[PDB]
Chain A
Amino acid sequence: AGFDRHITIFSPEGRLYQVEYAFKAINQGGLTSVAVRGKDCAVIVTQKKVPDKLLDSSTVTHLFKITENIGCVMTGMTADSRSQVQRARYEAANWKYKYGYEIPVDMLCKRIADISQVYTQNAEMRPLGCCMILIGIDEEQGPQVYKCDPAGYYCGFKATAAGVKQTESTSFLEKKVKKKFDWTFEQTVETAITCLSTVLSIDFKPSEIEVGVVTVENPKFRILTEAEIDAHLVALAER
């Protein structure tokens, strides 16, 4: 063949197989992340797996804060994830400097995604093998959830997942939105945790998951403590 092995060249069917391989690179990590939106809150959950006891559990995280009121969860290569996180933080601060107001979540996602496009069009560099999911509150639009992928697609979502169990998780979430009644903050967090736990079969403990939330009442992105996570987990088991 040879139509793979370079991002620039098109297949005879015009598919650009290299970026599709970058999509597989996300699943190679073996972790899953889920994001679900609510009427007044947006949450991100992801597996936290510590391979060795010696590792400091505090340092390992896939949840990062792009700015005070935006948070992200990265899935894929850890290094590419950290690099994209840094680029996102730079883009947000530069937006604030130039335009005088906090970057919208959609525009941040668009900037990061079009950067991913310049990666998937120029020859020498490779697409970053990571996926981003951004959550924030916009005053006009309420909560928001968005996802960047290695291709440059940046579509917004009511709820999403990324990682190895993405298809199972989106099947689960699709059923839940179809039986739409609402999602308050507690139900939002419960839906996220139930989705992740059901698709993985994990039956989590508080250490195994890390959750981050935004709410219209408290717009700042915060990563909940193990105690708060256990509080939500116990509520799930009780009912």
Chain B
Amino acid sequence: QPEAQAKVDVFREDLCTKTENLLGSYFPKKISELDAFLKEPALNEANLSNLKAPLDIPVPDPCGPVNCNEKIVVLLQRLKPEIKDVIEQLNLVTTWLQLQIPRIEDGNNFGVAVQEKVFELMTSLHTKLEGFHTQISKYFSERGDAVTKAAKQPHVGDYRQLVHELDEAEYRDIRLMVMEIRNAYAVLYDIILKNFEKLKKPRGETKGMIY
């Protein structure tokens, strides 16, 4: 039925335009923005003693409400949109590349292999970024469980240290996530730009006419 192909071709034309605009403008701009955030003073702090947040838990010889580290929370609040955005753009380009895959044929499988390699790196990036998204979620739960353990056992000293160390680890992980999202944008742009001819046109327009 040609109407279905017409609608799907409208969708694929929209995808091609969106992906081309993505590579042209959004990926470079986001690389710039993310390195700007990286060089910001907040993300790189000389002493994590400043990063340390107070625990108002009593110490032995019912506790007042303990609070999240505002530093970590603000850094996470600016980070999380970046993770969602990069995952969305990765999904867009992944779908675009999957649509460009040609009809399966015995010959001229080169160009299909190029798409396969680029798809492999896209899959790897997807895995790592989903891991980042999971990490942001589990940080709050781990900190909460640690402070609750501390409240249940005020005498145990190292639970305070567990809370503080979770905060410091999340800070360092946040800056590493910013670095990796930047580098993910860059490597995706580089690979697709270099291989764009085969990615867009795997088989090639050439027809031999041996027949």
Tell me the interface secondary structure of chain B in the complex. Answer: loop
Interface assignment of B110: CB less than 8 Å from any CB of chain A: yes
Tell me the interface secondary structure of chain A in the complex. Answer: loop
Nearest B residue to A11 via CB reads B110
Q: Once bound together, how far apart are the Cα atoms of A59 and B120, in whole Å?
A: 56
Q: Once bound together, how far apart are the Cα atoms of A12 and B203, in whole Å?
A: 10
Q: B99-142, CB under 8 A of A: which get 1 and which 0?
A: 00000000011110000000000000000000000000000000
Number of interface residues, chain B, beta carbon within 8 A = 4
CB distance from B21 to the nearest CB of A (A): 30
Q: Once bound together, how far apart are the Cα atoms of A13 and B113, in whole Å?
A: 13
Nearest A residue to B110 via CB reads A12
Q: Once bound together, how far apart are the Cα atoms of A13 and B110, in whole Å?
A: 8
Specify which chain B residues have a CB less than 8 angstroms from the CB of A13 in the assembled complex.
Answer: 110
CB distance from B95 to the nearest CB of A (A): 26
Nearest B residue to A13 via CB reads B110
Q: Once bound together, how far apart are the Cα atoms of A55 and B193, in whole Å?
A: 53
A-B contacts, 5 of them at CB < 8 A, read: A12-B108, A12-B109, A12-B110, A12-B111, A13-B110
Q: Once bound together, how far apart are the Cα atoms of A13 and B197, in whole Å?
A: 13
Number of interface residues, chain A, beta carbon within 8 A = 2
CB distance from B113 to the nearest CB of A (A): 9
Interface residues of B (CB under 8 A from A): 108-111
Q: Once bound together, how far apart are the Cα atoms of A12 and B109, in whole Å?
A: 8
Q: Once bound together, how far apart are the Cα atoms of A152 and B125, in whole Å?
A: 46
Q: A1-31, CB under 8 A of B: which get 1 and which 0?
A: 0000000000011000000000000000000
Q: Once bound together, how far apart are the Cα atoms of A13 and B109, in whole Å?
A: 11
Specify which chain A residues have a CB less than 8 angstroms from the CB of B108 in the assembled complex.
Answer: 12
Specify which chain B residues have a CB less than 8 angstroms from the CB of A12 in the assembled complex.
Answer: 108-111
Nearest B residue to A12 via CB reads B110
Specify which chain A residues have a CB less than 8 angstroms from the CB of B111 in the assembled complex.
Answer: 12
Nearest A residue to B109 via CB reads A12
Nearest B residue to A3 via CB reads B110
Q: Once bound together, how far apart are the Cα atoms of A13 and B204, in whole Å?
A: 11
Specify which chain A residues have a CB less than 8 angstroms from the CB of B109 in the assembled complex.
Answer: 12
Q: Once bound together, how far apart are the Cα atoms of A195 and B20, in whole Å?
A: 47
Q: Once bound together, how far apart are the Cα atoms of A140 and B108, in whole Å?
A: 50
Nearest A residue to B108 via CB reads A12
CB distance from B31 to the nearest CB of A (A): 31
CB distance from A7 to the nearest CB of B (A): 19
Q: Once bound together, how far apart are the Cα atoms of A116 and B110, in whole Å?
A: 29
Q: Once bound together, how far apart are the Cα atoms of A236 and B6, in whole Å?
A: 75
CB distance from B88 to the nearest CB of A (A): 34
Task: With a 10 A CB-CB cut-off, give which of B108, B109, B110, B111 has the most chain A CB atoms.
Answer: B110
Q: Once bound together, how far apart are the Cα atoms of A13 and B111, in whole Å?
A: 10
Q: Once bound together, how far apart are the Cα atoms of A117 and B88, in whole Å?
A: 53
Q: Once bound together, how far apart are the Cα atoms of A177 and B66, in whole Å?
A: 80
CB distance from B2 to the nearest CB of A (A): 33
Nearest A residue to B111 via CB reads A12
Q: Once bound together, how far apart are the Cα atoms of A12 and B108, in whole Å?
A: 6
Q: Once bound together, how far apart are the Cα atoms of A12 and B110, in whole Å?
A: 7
Q: Once bound together, how far apart are the Cα atoms of A142 and B136, in whole Å?
A: 79
Q: Once bound together, how far apart are the Cα atoms of A12 and B111, in whole Å?
A: 9
Closest 3 CB pairs of A and B: A12-B110, A12-B108, A13-B110
Q: A173-211, CB under 8 A of B: which get 1 and which 0?
A: 000000000000000000000000000000000000000
CB distance from B204 to the nearest CB of A (A): 10
Specify which chain A residues have a CB less than 8 angstroms from the CB of B110 in the assembled complex.
Answer: 12-13
CB distance from B172 to the nearest CB of A (A): 42
Q: Once bound together, how far apart are the Cα atoms of A132 and B108, in whole Å?
A: 37
Q: Once bound together, how far apart are the Cα atoms of A132 and B207, in whole Å?
A: 39
CB distance from A203 to the nearest CB of B (A): 41
Q: Once bound together, how far apart are the Cα atoms of A39 and B176, in whole Å?
A: 66
Nearest A residue to B107 via CB reads A12
